[PDB]
């Protein structure tokens, strides 16, 4: 396929808890000084998410290919804009209409085309010694691009392309969604200043833009870059320096939250309905502080542990070839009568011996007939 | 135009940022089937659509009536999935002059059946096989399993139900975002502090236009008050926000 990469010390992962993230503006309805709730793909409070290590200074460059579950929340605690790419696709063999989002050194390129892919595509920048120059040297993303469907190129701008190491100074919050095929992006830059796993606090989420794609997304990938300098042995397949990065990924669930808005109509307080018994009580009466008392809730429900089928031992087959075009049938005034019982009947088997013209089952849909016992 | 794709590899086209019309559809070719599900054809130019997607293919007349949002069938279950809440239009028209050869059409192919079920807006790129019950065969031209792709037999000597109908479905949404695909009605001057009728991208009504007092993100179109009616509107051209009373 393509080149491989080595010296990867793949260490066991660590589960870390979250604090009050994943609350955005759901739709167009501007709401000021009024509480509201909706049933949509959201993020629960206090969830045990998985964090992948990316510090090289060590020797870790991990980007697993996770299937695209409905709803994705992303939170990157960056310091030098390490994450630049995302890929969407199912087969990655220049036949699937794959989508590449890249924060290129000049533009922000969003390309929906037939790219042929390798095992672990990535990006790499080489740092010269005589001059402090940063420029995109290795672009190991796709092998061929024959069929295309969408192209967007952002404005030509320049970034610093830092290669520094230290503490996390920026937080990028993204939402990856799939509604009717669309791809809504909710981007938020946050001036954070810590060294390690996500801190507490909460703020509203600002949607960025809805990419009007309509292609299937079943698998996805978040991409990374690398640094090349004198510290490397002198090659790219084994010599590589990543840096230090941290990102969090969370699958979204069909949740519901009550939202608080001020006179300026801004998301300030959000509360759940199904996180503890108190949450439903708070969002039932459409307030935050409720007076001392007791209030009606839902009732306990039991999910069926099994779903069994109980039919009698019947093996006989209903003869329908004799019913449909066997040798000869009678007239209408002396209408031909046939009795059928004690056998299995089907409707999908009616489209083999002869193609029919009119087929109308009065009151009964043709799809359910095998599910009832006549 | 010149040639369209098959149904299993359905042709996708993206249309936006232009004016659309329905009365202009009756000039280049006279159509046969034209059914806009849920939407009357007379009102389409009066609404302002977003993200037009055209799915184009060619099928036999024996399955044209089957393509509809919510039924079953050979093609409706295993080749494409029309959503039940979906709002759009479907147009089918016969094409004998280009999709009907004297020796028959063999270039195009069609998949009668598929292994698993479908999801909305899905294209399959696998030649995997249909094989009786469970435990697949994987298929290499032998009997009592089923390779998915067969070829058509369209000749001018075939029947009416055996005619090649080009089918194109137009898909869109409404009342969800600032649109740009709306039509040939011309705008006029903007009047403030008066009880007048108004129109913004197909959204009509009567009220008073006043000045707003809040910062809004530059991708919001309409705000709804506690009564769920529109009380804030963004100007289509000056991009100023006006309150409705």
């Amino acid at each position, epitope marked *: 396929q393509c080149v491989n990469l080595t010296t990867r010390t793949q260490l066991p992962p660590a589960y870390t808890n979250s604090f009050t993230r994943g609350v955005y503006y759901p739709d167009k309805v501007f709401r000021s000084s009024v509480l509201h709730s909706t049933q949509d793909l959201f993020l629960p409070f206090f969830s045990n998410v998985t964090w992948f290590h990316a510090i090289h200074v060590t020797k870790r460059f991990d980007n697993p290919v996770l299937p695209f579950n409905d709803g994705v929340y992303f939170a990157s605690t960056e310091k030098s804009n390490i994450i630049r790419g995302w890929i969407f696709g199912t087969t990655l063999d220049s036949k699937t209409q794959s989508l590449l989002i890249v924060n290129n050194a000049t533009n922000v390129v969003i390309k929906v085309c037939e790219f042929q892919f390798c095992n672990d595509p990535f990006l790499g920048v080489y740092y010269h010694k005589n001059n402090k120059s940063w420029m995109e040297s290795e672009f190991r993303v796709y092998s061929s691009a024959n069929n295309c469907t969408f192209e967007y190129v952002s404005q030509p701008f320049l970034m610093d392309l830092e290669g520094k190491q230290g503490n996390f100074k920026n937080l990028r919050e993204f939402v990856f969604k799939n509604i009717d095929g669309y791809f809504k992006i909710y981007s938020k830059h946050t001036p954070i200043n810590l060294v390690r796993d996500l801190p507490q606090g909460f703020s509203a989420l600002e949607p960025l833009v809805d990419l009007p794609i309509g292609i299937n997304i079943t698998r996805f990938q978040t991409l990374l870059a690398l640094h090349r300098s004198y510290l490397t042995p002198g090659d790219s397949s084994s010599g590589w320096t990543a840096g230090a990065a941290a990102y969090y990924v969370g699958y979204l669930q069909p949740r519901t939250f009550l939202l608080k808005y001020n006179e300026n109509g801004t998301i300030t307080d959000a509360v759940d309905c199904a996180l503890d018994p108190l949450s439903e009580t708070k969002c039932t009466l459409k307030s935050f502080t409720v007076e001392k008392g007791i209030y009606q809730t839902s009732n306990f429900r039991v999910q069926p542990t099994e779903s069994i089928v109980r039919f009698p031992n019947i093996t006989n087959l209903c003869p329908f070839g004799e019913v449909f075009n066997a040798t000869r049938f009678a007239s209408v005034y002396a209408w031909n009568r046939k009795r059928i019982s004690n056998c299995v009947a089907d409707y999908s088997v009616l489209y083999n011996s002869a193609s029919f013209s009119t087929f109308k089952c009065y009151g009964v849909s043709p799809t359910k007939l095998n599910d009832l016992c006549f | 135009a010149t040639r369209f794709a098959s149904v299993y590899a359905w042709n996708r086209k993206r249309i936006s940022n232009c004016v659309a019309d329905y009365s202009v559809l009756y000039n280049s070719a006279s159509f046969s089937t034209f059914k806009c599900y849920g939407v009357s054809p007379t009102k389409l130019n009066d609404l302002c659509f977003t993200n037009v997607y055209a799915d184009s293919f060619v099928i036999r007349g024996d399955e044209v009536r089957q393509i509809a949002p919510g039924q079953t069938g050979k093609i409706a279950d295993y080749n494409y999935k029309l959503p039940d809440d979906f709002t759009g239009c479907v147009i089918a028209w016969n094409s004998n002059n280009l999709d009907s050869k004297v020796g028959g059409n063999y270039n195009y192919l069609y998949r009668l059946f598929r*292994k698993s079920n479908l999801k909305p807006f899905e294209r399959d790129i696998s030649t995997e096989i249909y*094989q009786a019950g469970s435990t697949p065969c*994987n298929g290499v031209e032998g009997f009592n399993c089923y390779f998915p792709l067969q070829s058509y037999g369209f000749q001018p000597t075939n029947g009416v139900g055996y005619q090649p109908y080009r089918v194109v479905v137009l898909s869109f949404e409404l009342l969800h975002a600032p649109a740009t695909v709306c039509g040939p009605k011309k705008s006029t001057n903007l009047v403030k502090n008066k009880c007048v009728n108004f129109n913004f991208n197909g959204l009509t009504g009567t009220g008073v236009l006043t000045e707003s007092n809040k910062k809004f993100l530059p991708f919001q179109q309409f705000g709804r008050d506690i009564a769920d009616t529109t009380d804030a509107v963004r100007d289509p051209q000056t991009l100023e926000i006006l309150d409705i009373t």
Partner: antibody
Amino acid sequence: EVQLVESGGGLVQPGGSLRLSCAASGFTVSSNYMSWVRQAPGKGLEWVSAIYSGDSTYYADSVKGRFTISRHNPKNTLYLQMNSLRAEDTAVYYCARLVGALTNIVVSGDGGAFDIWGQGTMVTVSS
Amino acid sequence: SYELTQPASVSGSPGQSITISCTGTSSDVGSYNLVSWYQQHPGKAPKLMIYEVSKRPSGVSNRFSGSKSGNTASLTISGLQAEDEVDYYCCSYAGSSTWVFGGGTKLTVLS
């Protein structure tokens, strides 16, 4: 050593019964294969005898109430108490093998490979 | 009493390829797979040459093959020799672990 041997052949008259047998040698019938293919020279064939032990609902809708058969695993031999033998059953049967999916022969695949047979017996139901 | 359609008389020149079929119905088109082809010198128990239609028998010359699509068949017997004038059958499913197969294609080698 490993061989399927048919035994228990005798004369059958209308109204009588007889106990046939297919004995495996080398491999025990407790965890092995037995497929009873019924052959009439010159025409098509049919696999009929539906005895996979455990005694649940698995039968063919052609010999209902006619072919009764028992299981004996440790003795490495199966007996066929073919009751109500019809005079139109003039055919020499063969107990044979198959292939499934479990062991090293199939890790990915389907199976179904009859590969080891018997020699058959000569039993005639004549009035 | 249960019997399915096969082409009884088939013949082919040595070194050529011949196609063998056995008939089923629409209740056998969705997604099953069970077809194993036979071989009989007349008058004795059969011989296994092809099973698991497009995969590998343990010890068998790889000149024989099978191919699978729709109502369009092949047991592809290629590289015919003088010892191929033998009887042939298939196998097939009948639903709920039941079984049925075809009516004995008989091959005659010419030349």
